[PDB]
Each structure stands twice: as C-alpha cells, then as structure tokens.
C-alpha cells in the first residue's frame, strides 16, 4: 500500500539543474520525515538531504550539496521535491527517496547523469 515513486532524473551538463519528485501513496507525506539518498555505480549509498515531518520545520543537507540542493514538500500533491542546482559530475548517481512506516520503503530510483 505504501509506495514511493521517484522521477525527474535525466542527462544534463555540468552547471545545469534538475528537479526530482518523490510521489508518495498509501500514506500522508506531510506526517513522515523523509530522506533523499543516492548511489553511484562503483560506490555505496550516500545521504543527500532530509525534511522533517509537519510540525516544526527542519531541513538538512549533506555538506557536499548544501547551498546547491533544496528539499521541499507539497502536502496536497503528497510529493517531496529535490531541486538540484549547479550540478557536478560527482553528483551522477541513482537518487532514491526513503521513508520509514514501520519498515523502510524506497522507490525504484531515478538516474541523474552530469556530463563534464
């Protein structure tokens, strides 16, 4: 019943921007803390950003993306967004959103490729 679906990835050149979406279903997005993470091919998973559930606002970013990425939420559309500006090739990876409703639930991921 709980389902996350990432989208918005693609192929851009260094310096461009993307906007990832995490469409949630089977539960209300606004009442859960959600994270974005990413996994590059030859490496292991890296936390990217987090947004606190509704009540006291709190957003957090990995140091390597702070100032370039913005996480935000649309409670009506039940969606979490990651605005990514000033993209670098080091940002190339599959991006996932994750929430814990008892267990953890993540999506299939969305591919972000940044060419130099």
Residue numbers in the entry: 1 to 116
List passages from the publication reporting this PDB structure.
Remarkably, CDR2 of Sb16 shows Y54 in starkly different positions in the unliganded structure as compared with the complex: the Cα carbon is displaced by 6.0 Å, while the Oη oxygen of Y54 is 15.2 Å distant, indicative of dynamic flexibility. These structures reveal that Sb14, Sb16, and Sb45 bind the RBD at the angiotensin-converting enzyme 2 interface and that the Sb16 interaction is accompanied by a large conformational adjustment of complementarity-determining region.
Here, we take advantage of available sequences of five SARS-CoV-2 RBD–directed sybodies: Sb14, Sb15, Sb16, Sb45, and Sb68 (previously designated Sb#14, Sb#15, Sb#16, Sb#45, and Sb#68, respectively). Each of the sybodies represents an immunoglobulin variable-type fold consisting of two β-sheets packed as a β-barrel linked by a disulfide bond.
